[PDB]
Amino acid sequence: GRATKSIPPIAFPD
Numbered sequence: 001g002r003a004t005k006s007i008p009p010i011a012f013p014d
Contacts, residue, residue: 002012 001014004010
């Protein structure tokens with residue numbers, strides 16, 4: 001469910 005504070009935001013499985 002993790003997401004990077006970037007664009008495009010990378011979404012992780014957690």
